[PDB]
PDB file of C-alpha atoms in Angstrom:
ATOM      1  CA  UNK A   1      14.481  12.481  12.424  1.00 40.15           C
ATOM      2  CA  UNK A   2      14.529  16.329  11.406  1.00 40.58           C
ATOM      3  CA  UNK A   3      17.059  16.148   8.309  1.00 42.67           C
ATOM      4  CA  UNK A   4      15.628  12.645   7.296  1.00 38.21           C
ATOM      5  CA  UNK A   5      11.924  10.972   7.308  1.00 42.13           C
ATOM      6  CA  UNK A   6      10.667   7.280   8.975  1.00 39.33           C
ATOM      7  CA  UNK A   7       7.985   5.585   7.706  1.00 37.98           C
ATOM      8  CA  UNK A   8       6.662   2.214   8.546  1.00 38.27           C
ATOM      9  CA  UNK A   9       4.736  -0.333   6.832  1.00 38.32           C
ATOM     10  CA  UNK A  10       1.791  -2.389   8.167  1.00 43.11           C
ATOM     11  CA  UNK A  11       1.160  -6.575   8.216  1.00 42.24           C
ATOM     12  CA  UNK A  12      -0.532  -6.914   4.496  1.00 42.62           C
ATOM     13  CA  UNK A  13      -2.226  -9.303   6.522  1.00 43.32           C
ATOM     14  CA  UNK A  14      -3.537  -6.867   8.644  1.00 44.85           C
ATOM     15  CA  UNK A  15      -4.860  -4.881   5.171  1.00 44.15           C
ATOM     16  CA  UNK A  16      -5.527  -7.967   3.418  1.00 39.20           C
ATOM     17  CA  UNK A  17      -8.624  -9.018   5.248  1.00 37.51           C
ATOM     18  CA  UNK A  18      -7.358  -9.010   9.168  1.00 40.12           C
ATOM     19  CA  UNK A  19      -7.828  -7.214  12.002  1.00 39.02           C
ATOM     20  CA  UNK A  20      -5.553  -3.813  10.692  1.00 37.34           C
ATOM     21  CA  UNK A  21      -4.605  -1.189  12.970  1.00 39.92           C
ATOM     22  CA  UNK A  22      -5.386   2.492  13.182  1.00 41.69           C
ATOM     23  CA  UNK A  23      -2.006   3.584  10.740  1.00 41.92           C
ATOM     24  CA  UNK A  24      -3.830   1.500   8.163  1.00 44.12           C
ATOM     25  CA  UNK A  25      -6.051   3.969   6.526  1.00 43.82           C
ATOM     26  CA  UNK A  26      -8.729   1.610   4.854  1.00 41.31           C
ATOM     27  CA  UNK A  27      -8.791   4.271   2.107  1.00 38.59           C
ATOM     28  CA  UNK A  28      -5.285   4.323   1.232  1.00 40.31           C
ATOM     29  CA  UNK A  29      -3.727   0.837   1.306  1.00 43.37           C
ATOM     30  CA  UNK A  30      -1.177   0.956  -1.073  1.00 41.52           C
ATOM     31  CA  UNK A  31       0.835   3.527   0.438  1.00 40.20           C
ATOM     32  CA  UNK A  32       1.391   1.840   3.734  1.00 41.19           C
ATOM     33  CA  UNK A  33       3.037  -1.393   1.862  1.00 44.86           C
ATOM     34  CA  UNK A  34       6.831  -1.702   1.318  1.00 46.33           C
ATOM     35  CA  UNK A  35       7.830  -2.747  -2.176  1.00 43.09           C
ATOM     36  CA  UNK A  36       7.318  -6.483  -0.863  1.00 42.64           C
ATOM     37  CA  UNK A  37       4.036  -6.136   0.393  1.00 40.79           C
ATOM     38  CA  UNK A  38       3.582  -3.859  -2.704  1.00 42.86           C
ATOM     39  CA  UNK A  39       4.914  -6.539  -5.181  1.00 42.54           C
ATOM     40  CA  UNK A  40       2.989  -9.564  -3.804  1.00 45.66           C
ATOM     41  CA  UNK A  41      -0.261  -7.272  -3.044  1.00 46.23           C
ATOM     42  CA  UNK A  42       0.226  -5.190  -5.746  1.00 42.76           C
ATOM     43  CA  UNK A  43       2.930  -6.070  -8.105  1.00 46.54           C
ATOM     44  CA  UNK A  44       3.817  -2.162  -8.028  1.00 48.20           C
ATOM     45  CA  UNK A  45       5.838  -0.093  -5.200  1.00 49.34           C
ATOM     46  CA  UNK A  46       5.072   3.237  -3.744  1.00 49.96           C
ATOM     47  CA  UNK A  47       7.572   4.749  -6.161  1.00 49.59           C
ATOM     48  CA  UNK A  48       5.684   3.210  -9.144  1.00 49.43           C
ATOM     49  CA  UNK A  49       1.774   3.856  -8.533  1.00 49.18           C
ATOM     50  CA  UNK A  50       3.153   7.246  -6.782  1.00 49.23           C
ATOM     51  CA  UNK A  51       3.466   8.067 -10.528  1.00 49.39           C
ATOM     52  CA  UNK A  52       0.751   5.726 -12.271  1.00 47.05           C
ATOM     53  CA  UNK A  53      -2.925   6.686 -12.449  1.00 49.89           C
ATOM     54  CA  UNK A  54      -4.734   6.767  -9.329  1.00 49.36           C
ATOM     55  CA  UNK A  55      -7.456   4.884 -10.832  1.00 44.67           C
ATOM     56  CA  UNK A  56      -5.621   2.241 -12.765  1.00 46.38           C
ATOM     57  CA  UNK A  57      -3.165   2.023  -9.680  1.00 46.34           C
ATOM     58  CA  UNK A  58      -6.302   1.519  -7.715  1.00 47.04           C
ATOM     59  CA  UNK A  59      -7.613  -0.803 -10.612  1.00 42.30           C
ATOM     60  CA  UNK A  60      -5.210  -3.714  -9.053  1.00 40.81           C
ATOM     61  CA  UNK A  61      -5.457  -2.964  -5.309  1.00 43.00           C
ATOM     62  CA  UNK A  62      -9.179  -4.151  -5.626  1.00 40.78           C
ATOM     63  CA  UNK A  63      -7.897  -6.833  -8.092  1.00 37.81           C
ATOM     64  CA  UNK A  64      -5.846  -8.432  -5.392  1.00 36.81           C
ATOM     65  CA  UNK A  65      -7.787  -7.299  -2.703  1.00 37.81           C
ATOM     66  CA  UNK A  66      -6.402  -4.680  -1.352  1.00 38.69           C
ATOM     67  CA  UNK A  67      -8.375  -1.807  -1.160  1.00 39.35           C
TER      68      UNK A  67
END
């Protein structure tokens, strides 16, 4: 908990056009999307648009429909 971190990712569903909860921020989608939900989403993963423009990174979220 203290020495090592949690995070938890959200129903793409749920940020791909469906009723999303409150931990989906509807202005950063990306980063609540495990490297699945990243690859079929967004073909990228939170370690590779973490580094990638935040533009261009965005420049596929709308593409599929993400953001």
């Amino acid at each position: 908990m203290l020495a090592k971190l949690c995070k938890t990712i959200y129903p793409l569903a749920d940020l791909l056009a469906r009723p999303l909860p409150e931990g989906v921020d509807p202005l950063k989608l990306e980063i609540y999307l495990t490297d699945e939900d990243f690859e079929f989403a967004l073909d990228m993963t939170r370690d590779e648009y973490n580094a990638l423009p935040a533009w261009k990174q965005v420049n596929l979220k709308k593409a599929k429909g993400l953001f």
